[PDB]
Design a protein around this ligand. Structure first.
Ligand SMILES: *Cc1c(COP(=O)(O)O)cnc(C)c1O
Ligand SMILES: *Cc1c(COP(=O)(O)O)cnc(C)c1O
Ligand SMILES: CS(=O)(=O)Cc1nc2ccccc2[nH]1
Ligand SMILES: CS(=O)(=O)Cc1nc2ccccc2[nH]1
Ligand SMILES: [Ca+2]
Ligand SMILES: [Ca+2]
Ligand SMILES: [Ca+2]
Ligand SMILES: [Cl-]
Ligand SMILES: [Mg+2]
Ligand code: NA
Lengths: 323, 322
């Protein structure tokens, strides 16, 4: 049916469990006091590499093949330099294979240094897609490597779904999961998992209003990517949903809540100040959603809500500016 | 025998457990790797009010009596707008009584707004220690209220001990606790509890080398308070140890580790960036201790080490300085 099944998610859990953390679910009286709800916070900001993306990246390194004629990847390649590049590099290090990140000439110095700092090799391209594509294909082919897309690769979607296996096991009375959405790898893997195991539990997406392709796609009933690169402080969710995650999100996600930049900022600061968790602002999206006016339409029967705090990779010096 | 015993800590536990958080114990591969030990972080930064001080404060509010006919305090009165006053204010809220904070008339608007934010009621005094004391005495008497010393009050020391009761359950094979020390209510409470329940477990104190009265006192065998008010980023451990906590510390604490300002700052930043926990610098004291050269020489048999991350009340904006 879909590009992954619950079986694939369990295969992914089996494949990655020896190398990830079973991150805690934390609670807060203060957030429970404010929102009306009984909240549970799945702390992927404490995951290895600082975000959940190690789940899909390690599943892809451990299950994908480079070629018909070679079962073992000899390198990994991606155009994504943030949380996905960091996680894919850590996964490749664990398996003893090199990682290459394809980076435009125009990337900021800090971005080049930091990819270097996380242990990958940089391969330069022109800021064009013809170039970026030529370059990554050439690298993938010459290194006998796997190209691992941050959100549309089935093995990555399946890995990110393992978050929901842990949540359901850790919070047996959970009523809904709230998941920030960018490309929808995490949303789709979670939705497959929850709807296969306990479809009475709601799956809600949380998205910046400034980057609201998932909401507009669910509204229209077809995939409507952002027409222009979005501007948002939620840097980790600027990708649009894509062809492999959209059908899952269309059919298996219950609702989508959009939040403004101010709402993301206020929720992020609230978590820092009152929960003492260094989430990145992208992980404040789901918190904003549950605090938002529209979330008041969620039935009072939906009491036990687990919000995924998806990452903690924040640049500290320069992130006090908006607070 | 001391101003408390373990019996007092068990009473405190029963008195407070329904209203405080049983805070989690978290771990970190990178910090294991930097220290060569199995570290366990007792996350009192997640406690109600953002520090462990609600344990001692609530125990005091539910134990101490006013100088009045009725047994129950009808208010709480404090000098503190920090972790102590915040804790006492919340304890007062739980008991449905006002909390008053005595404030010199010349406080900045910023401080006053901040105080009112956590719900204390300001009573003004003149800016001298004379007037502060006299106004606090008057208010406490007129309101049939109580005051609570931040580290020498026996009910406070007993409530702080409950930290260790939890740690010993959450980390059964723990070999040592590392505890930041200022006035030493936390350290003494913990030391009573550990030495009663599992005395082979080490109790180690950590303090800034800029405020090293605990280290000097243990070296000399006598209480040697700081000669002048210390300068340290570790704001919450500027107090010296006092007459009630000193004999417990003298007898039941195994060793004291001092750490420089730079070690405190680097430890605090390491916990922010690698553990994503927003500790205050005072809570980075204990981390800095376990990272320090002196600690590296501690016997390898002392493997499982529980560090108390004692608070998370840090001004986010001010962090720019360091
Ligand atoms: C990637 C990322 C997301 C979004 O995941 P998608 O699968 O792209 O929807 C959310 N939060 C953080 C911290 C991320 O790094
Ligand atoms: C009060 C405090 C301490 C020290 O406690 P004492 O009992 O005064 O030694 C340590 N850390 C934090 C965060 C504090 O608030
Ligand atoms: C992922 S972590 O935070 O680095 C380690 C951890 N995982 C936990 C799960 C439950 C309780 C405490 C836990 N400490
Ligand atoms: C405010 S708190 O103390 O972090 C709530 C809490 N306490 C826990 C203990 C164990 C696991 C998760 C936990 N969440
Ligand atoms: Ca290939
Ligand atoms: Ca979007
Ligand atoms: Ca000291
Ligand atoms: Cl006081
Ligand atoms: Mg497809
Ligand atoms: Na918490």
């Amino acid at each position: 049916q879909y590009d992954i099944s619950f079986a694939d998610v369990e295969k992914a859990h089996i494949n990655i469990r020896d190398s990830i953390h079973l991150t805690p679910v934390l609670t807060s009286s203060i957030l429970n006091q404010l929102t009306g709800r009984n909240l549970f916070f799945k702390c992927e900001l404490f995951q290895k590499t600082g975000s959940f993306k190690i789940r899909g990246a390690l599943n892809a390194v451990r299950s994908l093949v480079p070629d018909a004629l070679e079962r073992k990847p000899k390198a990994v390649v991606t155009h994504s330099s943030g949380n996905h590049g960091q996680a894919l590099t850590y996964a490749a290090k664990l398996e003893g294979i090199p990682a290459y990140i394809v980076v435009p000439q125009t990337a900021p110095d800090c971005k080049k240094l930091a990819i270097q700092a996380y242990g990958a090799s940089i391969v330069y391209c022109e800021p064009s897609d013809e170039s970026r594509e030529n370059v990554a294909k050439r690298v993938t082919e010459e290194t006998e490597g796997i190209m691992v897309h941050p959100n549309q690769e089935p093995a990555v979607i399946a890995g990110q779904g393992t978050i929901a296996l842990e949540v359901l096991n850790q919070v047996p009375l959970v009523d809904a999961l709230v998941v920030p959405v960018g490309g929808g790898g995490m949303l789709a893997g979670i939705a497959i998992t929850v709807k296969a195991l306990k479809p009475s539990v709601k799956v809600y997406a949380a998205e910046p209003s400034n980057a609201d392709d998932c909401y507009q796609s669910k509204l229209k009933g077809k995939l409507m990517p952002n027409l222009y690169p979005p501007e948002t402080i939620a840097d980790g969710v600027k990708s649009s949903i894509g062809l492999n995650t959209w059908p899952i999100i269309r059919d298996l996600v219950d609702d989508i809540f959009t939040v403004t930049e101010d709402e993301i900022k206020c929720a992020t600061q609230l978590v820092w100040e009152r929960m003492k968790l260094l989430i990145e602002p992208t992980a404040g999206v789901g918190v904003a959603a549950v605090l938002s006016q529209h979330f008041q339409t969620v039935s009072p029967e939906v009491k036990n809500i687990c919000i995924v705090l998806s990452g903690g990779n924040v640049d500290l010096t320069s992130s006090i500016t908006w607070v």
